[PDB]
RNA sequence: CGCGACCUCAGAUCAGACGUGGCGACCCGCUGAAUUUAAGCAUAUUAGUCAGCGGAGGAAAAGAAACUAACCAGGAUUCCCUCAGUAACGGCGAGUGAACAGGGAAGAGCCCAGCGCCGAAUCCCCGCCCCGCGGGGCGCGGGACAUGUGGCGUACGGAAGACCCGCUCCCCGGCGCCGCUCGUGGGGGGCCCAAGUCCUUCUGAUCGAGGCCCAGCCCGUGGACGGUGUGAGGCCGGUAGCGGCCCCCGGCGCGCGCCCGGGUCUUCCCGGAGUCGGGUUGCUUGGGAAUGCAGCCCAAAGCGGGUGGUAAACUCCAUCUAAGGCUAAAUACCGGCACGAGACCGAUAGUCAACAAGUACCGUAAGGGAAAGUUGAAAAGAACUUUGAAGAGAGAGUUCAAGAGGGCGUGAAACCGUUAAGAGGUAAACGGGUGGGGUCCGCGCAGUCCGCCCGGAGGAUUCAACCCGGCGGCGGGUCCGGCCGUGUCGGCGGCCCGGCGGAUCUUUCCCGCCCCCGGGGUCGGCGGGGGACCGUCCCCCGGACCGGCGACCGGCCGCCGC
RNA sequence: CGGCUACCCACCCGACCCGUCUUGAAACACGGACCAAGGAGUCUAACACGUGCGCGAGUCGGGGGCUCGCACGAAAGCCGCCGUGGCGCAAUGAAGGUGAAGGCCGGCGCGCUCGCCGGCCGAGGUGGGAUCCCGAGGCCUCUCCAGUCCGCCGAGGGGCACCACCGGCCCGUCUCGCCCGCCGCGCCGGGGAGGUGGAGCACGAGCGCACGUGUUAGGACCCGAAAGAUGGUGAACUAUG
RNA sequence: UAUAGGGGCGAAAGACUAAUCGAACCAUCUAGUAGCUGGUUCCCUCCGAAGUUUCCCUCAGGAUAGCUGGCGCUCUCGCCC
RNA sequence: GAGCCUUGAAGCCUAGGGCGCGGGCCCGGGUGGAGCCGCCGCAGGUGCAGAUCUUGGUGGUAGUAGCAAAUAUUCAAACGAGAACUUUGAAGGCCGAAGUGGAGAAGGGUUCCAUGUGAACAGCAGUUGAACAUGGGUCAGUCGGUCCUGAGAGAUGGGCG
RNA sequence: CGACUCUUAGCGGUGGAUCACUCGGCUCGUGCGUCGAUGAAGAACGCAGCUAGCUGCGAGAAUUAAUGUGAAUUGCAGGACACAUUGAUCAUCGACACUUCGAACGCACUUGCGGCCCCGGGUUCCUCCCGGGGCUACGCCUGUCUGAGCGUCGCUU
């Protein structure tokens, strides 16, 4: 139950801050869960997604055994796009399909020095 | 406009009272503000007690409320001089000083002096340097408390004289009748006219 | 409202220009100029009886009636039929009002609290609250209240040692104190007989805080228990007692209908 | 005639510094109506308000009595409840309308002009040095202010000067650092638990049942939001004196700078002026023989002046010391910056404005002032063929759905078109009564009713009839074996190893005191403490009643499934 | 086969188009082309009455305070040497002021159109008055005997609520009369008997809460004016230099 | 360019003063007041009037009484009077 | 109420079935796609036929009145799907120097010019325009403002408030 | 037989009522106390690759520098794809910058007309000569400089 009086249980204010949040807040909102082997190996529950993360889709029209790599992350639309998931238009031109990043299981992460610092902070705060 | 049998009313609502409406919607707000003010005072100020300066035993000027007692304002400089301490030294001790309050009653004088002696007995002070004037060792483990509540020595002290047992007595019961009040009233109403008639009797030889 | 719909300045036409006698906003170009002004029957108009901030909202109750309602609610929480007719599941539950030990109030982990409710068979009453956690009916979903969560048991205690932590996120449960008895929590919705779970110190402090009909309450200064209107109130026992049936006329069960 | 000093002055684009204007919800100062009421209207009420004008601050104003009272006297200002719709004002009509107590919130007091004493021991500016990081402030040398009066000591509560007594020796402003603090000081960034497990539908699922005898898992975290719909676990976030870093503010502790109060006696000083008050006149007030303010005139006193609610004279008493000034507190805030909540509204409602709203537009101008939300989960916004110059259409295609195709959710009424049925000279329409036609509903139409008992015909089963074995309840008696309920005495036993109340007591008890002759006297008086007695609860055995919703066990008659 | 029916049609009879102002509407009286949405007795304060609840000669915390920092908590619980205070328990007067108990028995002063002492009872009497109590008497298959039993009642008594009257007490005026007391003998106080006016007493029923009706002030059931005041904007039309 | 609202200007019509002039326009007081027109929103059941006395600067209005409704209370009968 | 449901809630339509005298309600069939209801108490901005009611939409009138102030058009060709209206040749007329002409002050602000489209506006129409979209166009010592005073408006000194 | 008119039902067309949602209002309360001569509020003009409005900015103009976070903004081409160099975007912003009018300040405001000082080139110099920078409003306070007085006085011709 909410106890701090400096945060809202208010639907209008939460939807306002959600649909008008800046991009550094939208990066924290667009976060994806991890696979069971990667969370067993790293001891971390959730991570933000980036351009070169490999993605297995768990829900939607396409489900499972589709370990592909994302290409674009529209934070304005709250939608990542996956190279494996395609759909043809009327004129035979392919186009990516809108997938929300909360229905996304990450199987591989991109390694970077900043991501090692992030993973160290995750493991230290999880303790 | 009026009607059947009812009381004649003169409501004072002809003036534009709609603009000036003050309704206590912030009454629990002021309650929480003043709780926080009292608690922040007890935190920040001192181990001085709440309602810091001590108030005197004071009678209320009326024919109505003079049977009761009251916590006054200050200790009435003649009383403080009989108690024998300096004015601002008393203000730093905790004595409330009001220079306006006079003294007509020796009884109230001695009552406030004994109240000051009791306060001086209950006083425990702590200076900064350990040269120890008016102190000593750890007096009652820093006096067992930090802050008193609602007056230090219970400033009401409604004294209760009883006089429960006495035997029926001599002709006071035959002399203190209703006629004494009427005779005193007539004497007070005709005091000066008898003096004028005595002056005229001395004038007319 | 507090700010009028009289922001639009307007005048009425009168006899000529026979549209109406209602005031009309005056101007040109804008097609609002000539429409309905302030008034109740007009578009964009000030409402009839604008709700004011000086309405008599809050209602004072006598303290004797407050304590009377607390005593009546606590008395109605003892009978099994009243609480079963209110709807708590008291099938596998042991004896009425439950008195738990003083080791209950020192709980910190709520797994022990869930285990205690399962062993005391209040888990059915919690499971009813689990089964009914539906969505709010109507337009009340906009003002941040979107859950119909029914009330379950309440645990009344003193000397808090973590019992609010152990009983804080159970659905349907109610935090309640001995020295602060709430009518709105002991009988929500004005319906008496809520299932309650007491502690040893609570169940002994009730007799200290209200008393019997012999002595007064020792914590409350000027309170006594109410006068009992009908002492032995079994109406079937009274009407079937021999003292009443000694002085009855006769059982008259003839009908004497209409004779054609 | 000239030079010099003071005083009244001017000048500058001299050096340095200051005011203008905005906002104006709250606050201060001025002045300022009428609509309305009085059923008419002048006094009155609306109102010392709307409007107008001048100012500042987060509060403002007020604020240390020229006070209230009239008795066993209180004692700065402000805010609330009462006083009180009272005293009182009013064509005493309508109406208007306080204050002192008293209970609470908060409570902090002071300074200067005069009187005098200190050789102006006082302040501003200029120039160089002592000086420290993020910067200006003590001290050195000469130019001014000021004797027509700086500062120190002083303030009506008395103060000062000189002896006597006895002690005290002292604080406010800097600077480096250690551990904290009641939310665990302020703000910001970033991080913190637990299913996405098999079946099932669905376009999508967050739907639906279950996860071993330990309840699949977490909870100090089941608030809320988005996510293809209804989630505590899938994601920000939610609980936690949960955990880490950076920035700022406070009180501890080395240098520099200043530093005599109290009691007795003697002497001396002791106050605010066109101000009070009086006459007269306007506004205001509840203030009336004038509450306050202001204009004009007359205009003080020093055992004085003011107040003491009825004008005046005489007399007595109480209280205060006006014509100089400062100060946080409780109080107000429809302006502003950020924040949270709602028994409120839900696109004709709610602010005029959910949207490129004070926008489009109108008037020369002051000013007036709108209409207007919704495709779908995703644009995947209909490729391609074909008629037409195109608008548009017929196929095909996407989507769960074009019956969602660009103001595109749902799609009613008024109105119109077409189809189907019926009718048509007294305009149409209606009520009562039927008849005809049509849509539709239920039923099987010369065959549809059921539940029980008994006399008949075959099969298949085992109780029941009686008892043994067994558990659970109903009912009363010995109230037997023990608990508990109501009143009665008793041990006064927990009265000192008890709870509460008593303007019922004990001056042979104690302490702090007063009186009369260091001691004595209950000789008398006050407060506090100990206990004597009264009015309800805690034990016990003995008795009475009910065994009463307070029930355990044994036995008895009669139920009960296996 | 049956079916009432917001379907259609025909036939017999009756049938003027609703709302209001009005004695009178179908009116040659007024509003109404049609349809969808909005639209008119609310709220505050005060009073009165009725009702329900709690306490009840008391009642009420609305003003503050106490709890640890809790979403619901702007809730709720408590104060009691916080009852200050509002209303009620006492009224009458303009006011100084005064202020609601009488009755019975015995004794005395000439039981005198007259006061005192001792004891007792205690809010008076009359006529009604729900109810209640006592009870002559009567009645249950054959005789004396009986207890509760079936079982009413002439008459009698005590008399709630209230009604009608009389009498009594308190206060202010009016009339007539005598006495008592001295912290001081006076243009000092008090008392007696009658007739009066009062919103009085004559065993008190109020306080708080909530609902309903009615009235009043507030915009106040909704809409409506000719008018007045305050402050600003216009001589680009027109009038005159 | 000057005269700006009880003001201006007027060879004078009370004519003109931004389509408005026997007192302009805009906003505020203001939702001014009206004894005066119009309207006033679901059903059923029960009871059910008056246009009259008196008074008022009263005659289109109001107060009082009457007529009416609601809420009750006190009793009476069910068992030769 | 272990209420209802994406195996379809609210809303709407309905020659369907029914209940209650009535306010209204329940079920059947169809569009629709995400919230709704029964009982007990509580609180209302709670029920429409009218108010020359306010807002919005739509009929009869009605394909009706009306597209008639200023003498008037006609043939052929061309661009064009399409010509009574666009352009050119030719014929006939009007304005007739107080113009239906050539340029300005005020006022308009891109309307000026070229190209392309013709849904939209031009009261019929368009291939046309002052419509729409795109791209261009205003060059000063000697033209005017700037300088000067005119009627007048105005600040300091001063006075009033 | 048809045409026209009326009443129901289906479907279609104008219409946007009802229902569902709300990045919106309204109320209440808490926290803070903040504008400007060092140029406030407000207004005009300008700024994006394609850019009318709103929004955001001021010739450094869709933002500059710095801190924090950490791989993008996006409708489209381009551009830095670097991250064992310096790092895109976003928020904070404490450092720089802030056209003109505006209390508006050299005058009134017609973007006009000046007056001083300094710096660069123009006859290498003022003499009403081009560009750039600084100053130039009123009132008033303290101090400095100058001089007006038959206001008062001293010494002297
Ligand atoms: Mg909100
Ligand atoms: Mg009436
Ligand atoms: Mg008014
Ligand atoms: Mg208003
Ligand atoms: Mg207005
Ligand atoms: Mg509105
Ligand atoms: Mg609804
Ligand atoms: Mg100002
Ligand atoms: Mg009138
Ligand atoms: Mg009038
Ligand atoms: Mg007045
Ligand atoms: Mg004003
Ligand atoms: Mg300020
Ligand atoms: Mg002051
Ligand atoms: Mg003083
Ligand atoms: Mg009163
Ligand atoms: Mg007067
Ligand atoms: Mg009156
Ligand atoms: Mg007044
Ligand atoms: Mg959700
Ligand atoms: Mg959720
Ligand atoms: Mg998580
Ligand atoms: Mg004096
Ligand atoms: Mg005098
Ligand atoms: Mg005097
Ligand atoms: Mg006197
Ligand atoms: Mg007097
Ligand atoms: Mg003063
Ligand atoms: Mg203050
Ligand atoms: Mg809508
Ligand atoms: Mg609108
Ligand atoms: Mg969408
Ligand atoms: Mg569908
Ligand atoms: Mg649609
Ligand atoms: Mg649809
Ligand atoms: Mg036909
Ligand atoms: Mg009539
Ligand atoms: Mg007539
Ligand atoms: Mg009619
Ligand atoms: Mg007519
Ligand atoms: Mg009509
Ligand atoms: Mg009509
Ligand atoms: Mg409606
Ligand atoms: Mg009552
Ligand atoms: Mg009292
Ligand atoms: Mg007038
Ligand atoms: Mg004026
Ligand atoms: Mg002109
Ligand atoms: Mg003329
Ligand atoms: Mg004339
Ligand atoms: Mg004339
Ligand atoms: Mg005109
Ligand atoms: Mg006129
Ligand atoms: Mg006028
Ligand atoms: Mg009105
Ligand atoms: Mg009006
Ligand atoms: Mg009459
Ligand atoms: Mg009439
Ligand atoms: Mg009447
Ligand atoms: Mg009656
Ligand atoms: Mg009746
Ligand atoms: Mg939807
Ligand atoms: Mg219903
Ligand atoms: Mg309404
Ligand atoms: Mg509502
Ligand atoms: Mg209607
Ligand atoms: Mg009607
Ligand atoms: Mg109409
Ligand atoms: Mg209309
Ligand atoms: Mg519309
Ligand atoms: Mg039409
Ligand atoms: Mg025609
Ligand atoms: Mg023409
Ligand atoms: Mg051709
Ligand atoms: Mg051709
Ligand atoms: Mg032609
Ligand atoms: Mg031609
Ligand atoms: Mg010409
Ligand atoms: Mg052109
Ligand atoms: Mg056309
Ligand atoms: Mg063309
Ligand atoms: Mg154009
Ligand atoms: Mg040239
Ligand atoms: Mg020229
Ligand atoms: Mg002037
Ligand atoms: Mg001047
Ligand atoms: Mg940068
Ligand atoms: Mg320059």
UniProtKB/Swiss-Prot annotation, chain A:
The gene is RPL26. Keywords: Cytoplasm, Isopeptide bond, Phosphoprotein, Ribonucleoprotein, Ribosomal protein, Ubl conjugation. One of its GO terms (cellular component) is large ribosomal subunit. One of its GO terms (biological process) is translation. The keyword Transmembrane does not apply. It is found in: Cytoplasm. Ufmylated by UFL1 in response to endoplasmic reticulum stress, promoting reticulophagy of endoplasmic reticulum sheets. It comes from Oryctolagus cuniculus. Belongs to the universal ribosomal protein uL24 family. The keyword tRNA-binding does not apply. Component of the large ribosomal subunit. Interacts with DHX33. This is Large ribosomal subunit protein uL24.
